[PDB]
Structures are given as structure tokens and as C-alpha cells.
């Protein structure tokens, strides 16, 4: 062992959340978090991101990638997310990945105008920046600490500034973590039109998670986990159904206990998950190097 | 298309006669709610128990080396037999022909190293398996096997005993009840077994197979707490496994309690046993490949 059994909490406490926001987000989102939890977040996220009809149409009907190749879509998305999370928006390795995502979105926008308003870039990024926070609160665990919240804000405000939308690069971002939460909650309270494309996509997204981590007879358990964590508003909008009240209390407690065990009790990891992944003989699919492009709009 | 009611397994046991239908009751106890993960957990807890006698850890760890050098294959190969026995029971030719193969294996091993397969150890090992889920449940704060499950488990393993070869002959004189099986297991585990390096080496390779299969990379620590929380204090000391972190132990035992509660009491019962489910998959899962068999020499009588 190179490090003390407990060092992550302490190292965050030592850092400045206004300067070291990249490092704090990395410590928050890439050490205790593994491929399973990161997949859980993506699974909860895509149906949130696609509350606008044009988004569920785009993914579910137009490209079909989530429906016909759900596993590849999940792996492809996460290759980018892990890279961003490891290095942050000031780093060229993350920026060149984002440049590729911007190029993808730009071509999609020509196929279907109105799919990429800045509103949705703010929402999606804000969702991700508060995701683990909200998941923890749903499981009865404490929210992110003061420094984690401030860092998460600066991290996502930073990525916002280099994130393309049909309204241009996202210059005017929520002002604080609390402002990100309120944006996400306000957006989720909007009167989105309910559409069959949303149901179809939500189901394909859910099934990817089940197929990866809860195969065969385990499906039912995995379903309770997702339906226990997905917001009531998004479940209704996408016809996902509702958790069994008894199962929900149990699965949330099990998630609570697992996170408690790895955070408070068992030794902290010495390396981030991406680092661990790059030591494996075969590169795990979520940790393959994302495709990159020319950096057009550099971080300021 | 649900074919069965959400809850039918408990009720089916309740309708059965544990003195006649013991094979079916054991099947309902050990092959529906149990999956490959839990079955692997039972194997992992079992081998170091079975090898408390030095000659057993020597045989597996030094002589054949299979559990040390090919742990995953050993686990799969053992469980192919266990699932088959559990699905059909000792009165069934399919299980008998598998056991005949295991008897042949043990017979050749016993010639290589006499004293490795006394009736004592066949009784202990089979009794350990017959009370394994019972003890695991009690360790996790759940109720033990029900009246009929206990009776059936006894008859099941008494039956297998009668066709199980040992160096003292086929095991005719078996513990007389579930309670007697539990006391035999407890008495054996209280014995003053000689502590030997072969035991440490084997116990650690057994543990590592489980970690490698279900708790890879950073998950290992969690997997270790699970095993060390369930393994008996006596066997941990004997095999230098160490002791669980008291905080982690309480957490992992509650998580196991809750998972079993969820699948048993809350979520719909499975419609098919795990072997049945397994035989529907495009590729046969390794635990559920049909075991190697031999000619039935000593047929079940009862
Ligand atoms: C909100 C509206 C958005 C829509 C409708 C959308 C849709 C898509 C589509 C259609 C793809 C191509 C793969 C496919 O056919 O499914 C894609 C790729 C991607 N998007 Fe978005 N996106 C949106 C916003 C965002 C945001 C805000 C992020 C990140 C913060 C993001 C991250 C990605 C990544 C990393 C990929 C690459 C995945 C792959 O190559 O399959 N998207 N998106
Ligand atoms: C009492 C001491 C026992 C010892 C030392 C022992 C040892 C062994 C050995 C060495 C093998 C061959 C595979 C290897 O190289 O590891 C084997 C096979 C097997 N034994 Fe035993 N055994 C014992 C008792 C039992 C009992 C009581 C059962 C079941 C109730 C059992 C079930 C099996 C099965 C299913 C196999 C086949 C696994 C394979 O082919 O890899 N053993 N045993
Ligand atoms: Cl953070
Ligand atoms: Cl299954
Ligand atoms: Cl890892």
C-alpha cells in the first residue's frame, strides 16, 4: 500500500474548490465510482436528457443506436465521460474528445434542427453535475460536501463554455451548484409532450443496464434499482412504471450500505478507475480512448 | 406471459410430504432462489471446511494442484455435479451416474494417498452441504430451513450417503436427522486439526477464485469481507484467512439478509430452476454443462 487507508476525504479538504475544481471532481466521480455505478448514472441520465420529444425521436427513431446497439452506445458515451472526468476541461485530452462530440452533435442538428438548444446542453450537463448528489440523497446518504458542490459547479461551468449548441457555445451557465439543482428541477417540472419515442428509448436504455449487470433472473432486481432512482416525473413521462414500495426501500438501503462500505469502512483505492482500467490486459470498453477531433474552441 | 403465481415455492413445499418428496423439497430449497453466484459462494466456503484434515489440503493443494493452478475449472467442474444432484436427487439415474464418476475419481486418489477419504469425511462434507444454506442464513440473521426443508435435507443427504464411496465402504451409517447432521458438523469443526501450510495455500487459492469471478479488481476487499464474515472462526484460523472487519461484517451480513429477503419475500418467485434457465441460454453456462458420468455400480435402494 502506497497511501493511507483513508486519504480521499482529507485530500479534498486540503484543496481549494475554486482552483482545484478538476481534481476535486475527479476525486468525487472516478475513485469510488466503478463501471457499474457509471453505467447506472448513464442509464438514469439518457431518459432525463431526452424529455424533449425531438431528443427521443433523434436517438430512438432517427439514429436508432440506443435501440439497436445499446451496449455500444453506453460504452461509447462513457469513454468520453471518464476522459472528461479524469482530466477536466482545461486539459487538451478532454477538450479533443469534446470537440468530437461537438462535431457529432453538429451533424445531427443538420439532420433535425431544434434538437440541440443551449437549454438542453445546460440541462444535460447540470444533470450530470448533480447526478451522484441526487442519487445519494435518494438512497438516504449525505449530499456532496461544500467543496465537492463548488468544484462540480466550476467543472461543469467550464465544460459548458466549450460545449456547442444550436444557440452557440454555452456562455451563460447556472451560477452555482444550487442554481444547477434548480435548473434541473425546473426543467423536470416542465410540461413536456409525452411521446411513444420516449417510452421506446427509455425501455431500450433500461434494458442495456439490465443486460449488462442484472442478466437472466436478476433482471427484476435491476429494474427495482432503476425505478427506485429514476425521478417520478421521468418514469411517468416515459411509461417506465413504478417500483414496488417494499423493494424500493430495500434496494435503496442496499445501495446506501454498499456506498457506506466502500467510502467509510474499506480502504480507499490508491488509483482512479480509469487508471486501474489501463493496467488491465484487455482494455475495459468504458475506458478505451475516446475518438478525438481538432480543438476549435479552446478553454479560456 | 407469467405461467405461475408470483409466490408458489413456499406453498409447493407446504403441500409436499418431506419423507417421500424430499428430493423435490431440496430442489425447491437449493436451486430456484440460488444462482451461480450463491452456489459459488457455498463451494468457496465449503472446500476449506472439507479439507480441515491435513491429507485433504495436501491432496488438493500439493498432489493434484487443480484448485491452486486451475481454480476456476475446479469450481465449475465441482458445481456441474452439485447442480445435477440437487436438481434430480439420489433416486435418479442422472445424478447416480454423475456420483459414480466422482466415486471413481476419489477411488484413484485414495490409492495415491490412503487415509484421505474416510467415511468420517464423506459424512462431514455431505452434512456440511446439507446444512450450508441453513448456517449461512442464520449467520445473516435470517430464519433457518423450515420444518419440511430440514427433514427433506436430511433424507436427501442420507440417500446420497448410501451410494457415496469411502475408504471404509459405502456410507451406510449416516447421521439420523438434520439436527444430527448439524451436531456432527459442529463436533468435527471443534476437533484439534493439525495446522499445515497446505491448508493456508489451498484456502487462499479457493478464496481467490471467488474474488476473481465475482469481486474483480477494486471489489476484492468487499468480496473478502463477505467470505470472512461467513467462514467459521475455526476454519479461518486453521487456514490463516484472517478475520473480518467487525463494521464491514455487520454491513455485508445485512446486505445478504436483505438480498435474500428481496428475492424470497418480495420479488416474484422464478418460474424455472436455475439449471433449467441455464439450459435455455444460447451458450451453456459452465456450471450447468452436464457433468461427466460413469457406469452405475452401486445403485440407490433407499
Ligand atoms: C440534449 C440533447 C442531446 C441529444 C439529442 C444528443 C444525442 C446524441 C446522439 C444522437 C449521439 C450519437 C449516438 C447516437 O446515435 O445515439 C450523441 C453522441 C454523444 N453525446 Fe449527445 N446528445 C445531446 C446532448 C449531449 C450532452 C449535453 C452531452 C454531454 C454533456 C452529450 C454527450 C454525448 C457523447 C459523449 C456522445 C458520443 C456517444 C457515441 O459516440 O455514441 N450529449 N448524442
Ligand atoms: C473428504 C475429502 C475429499 C477430498 C480430499 C476430495 C478431493 C477431490 C479431488 C482431488 C478431486 C479431483 C479434482 C482435483 O484435483 O482437485 C475431487 C473431485 C470431486 N469431488 Fe471430491 N474430495 C473429497 C470429498 C468430497 C465429497 C464428500 C464430495 C461431495 C459430497 C466431493 C465432490 C467432488 C466432485 C463433484 C468432484 C469432481 C470435481 C472435478 O472433477 O474437478 N468430494 N475431489
Ligand atoms: Cl466535485
Ligand atoms: Cl438465470
Ligand atoms: Cl478496478
Residue A65, all three cell numbers: 443506436
Q: How far apart are CA B216 and CA B228, in angstroms?
A: 17
Q: How many angstroms separate the CA atoms of B84 and B99, rounded?
A: 10
- Going from the C-alpha of A283 to that of each of A120, A239, A289, the distances in angstroms are 32, 36, 9
A31 by DSSP, 3-state: which?
coil
Q: Do B266 and A276 touch (CB under 8 A)?
A: no
Q: Residue holding cell 447442480?
A: B83
CA of B213 to the centre of ligand 5 (A): 13
CA of B37 to the centre of ligand 2 (A): 20
Closest CA to B178 of B156, B198, B193: B156
Question: Residue B71 is inside which H or E element, if any?
Answer: helix B71-88
| Helical spans, DSSP H, in A189-281 | 196-213, 219-229, 232-238, 245-260, 273-278
Q: Do B259 and A261 touch (CB under 8 A)?
A: no
Could you tell me the three cell numbers for B179? 439436527
Closest residue of A to B225, CA-based? Answer: A266
Query: Rounded to the nearest 10 degrees, how much is the dihedral formed by the CA atoms of A122, A123, A126, A128?
Result: -120
Method: X-ray
Cβ-defined contact of A254 to B252 (cutoff 8 Å) = no
- Torsion sign (Cα): B228, B231, B235, B239: negative
Q: Is B180 exposed, middle or buried (0-12, 13-18, 19+ CB in 10 A)?
A: middle
Write out the three cell numbers for B160. Answer: 446420497
The candidate with the shortest Cα–Cα distance to B66, out of B200, B202, B196, B224, is B202
Residue A295, judged by CB atoms within 10 A of its CB (0-12, 13-18, 19+), counts as middle
Cβ pairs A/B, distance under 8 A: 59
The answer to whether A78 touches A290, Cβ cutoff 8 Å, is: no
List Cβ neighbours of B100 (8 Å cut-off, separation of 6 or more): B293, B294, B295, B296, B297, B298
Identify the closest residue of chain B to A34 by CA–CA distance: B218
Select from A34, A218, A247 the Cβ nearest to the Cβ of B218: A34
Structural resolution in Å: 1.8
Alpha-carbon gap, residue B189 to B181, rounded angstroms: 12
Q: Are B142 and B260 in contact (CB under 8 A)?
A: yes
Report the SS3 class of residue A74.
helix
Q: Helix H segments across chain A?
A: 8-14, 21-29, 35-49, 53-57, 65-68, 70-87, 92-111, 118-129, 131-138, 146-161, 177-188, 196-213, 219-229, 232-238, 245-260, 273-278
**Rounded Cα–Cα distance for residues A232 and A252 (Å):** 15
- CA nearest to A29, candidates A228, A298, A256, A269: A269
Interface test with B, best of A216, A249, A255 (most B CBs within 10 A): A216
Amino acid at each position: 500500500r502506497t497511501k493511507p487507508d483513508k486519504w480521499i476525504r482529507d485530500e479534498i479538504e486540503r484543496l481549494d474548490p475554486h482552483v482545484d475544481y478538476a481534481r476535486i471532481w475527479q476525486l468525487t466521480m472516478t475513485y469510488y465510482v466503478d463501471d457499474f455505478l457509471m453505467n447506472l448514472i448513464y442509464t438514469l441520465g439518457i431518459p432525463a436528457f431526452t424529455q424533449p420529444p425531438l431528443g427521443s425521436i433523434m436517438m430512438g427513431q432517427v439514429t436508432r443506436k440506443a435501440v439497436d446497439h445499446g451496449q455500444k452506445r453506453a460504452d461509447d458515451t462513457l469513454q468520453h465521460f471518464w476522459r472528461w472526468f479524469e482530466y477536466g476541461p482545461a486539459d487538451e485530452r478532454a477538450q479533443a474528445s469534446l470537440a468530437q462530440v461537438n462535431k457529432i452533435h453538429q451533424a445531427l442538428a443538420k439532420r433535425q434542427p431544434g434538437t440541440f438548444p443551449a437549454r438542453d446542453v445546460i440541462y444535460t450537463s447540470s444533470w450530470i453535475g448533480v447526478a451522484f448528489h441526487r442519487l445519494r440523497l435518494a438512497a438516504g446518504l449525505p449530499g456532496l460536501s461544500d467543496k465537492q458542490r463548488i468544484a462540480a459547479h466550476h467543472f461543469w461551468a467550464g465544460f459548458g463554455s466549450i460545449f456547442w449548441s444550436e444557440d452557440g457555445y454555452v456562455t451563460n451557465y447556472p451560477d452555482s451548484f444550487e442554481a444547477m439543482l434548480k435548473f434541473v428541477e425546473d426543467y423536470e417540472a416542465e410540461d413536456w409532450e409525452k411521446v411513444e419515442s420516449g417510452r421506446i428509448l427509455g425501455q431500450a436504455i433500461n434494458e442495456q443496464f439490465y443486460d449488462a449487470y442484472f442478466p437472466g433472473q436478476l433482471r427484476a432486481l435491476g429494474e427495482q434499482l432503476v425505478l427506485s432512482l429514476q425521478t417520478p416525473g421521468i418514469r411517468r413521462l416515459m411509461d417506465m412504471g413504478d417500483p414496488d414500495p417494499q423493494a424500493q426501500k430495500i434496494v435503496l438501503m442496499m445501495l446506501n450500505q454498499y456506498l457506506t462500505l466502500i467510502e467509510d469502512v474499506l480502504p480507499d483505492p490508491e488509483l482512479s478507475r480509469p487508471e486501474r482500467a489501463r493496467l488491465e490486459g484487455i482494455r475495459p470498453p468504458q475506458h478505451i480512448d475516446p475518438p478525438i477531433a481538432k480543438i476549435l474552441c479552446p478553454f479560456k
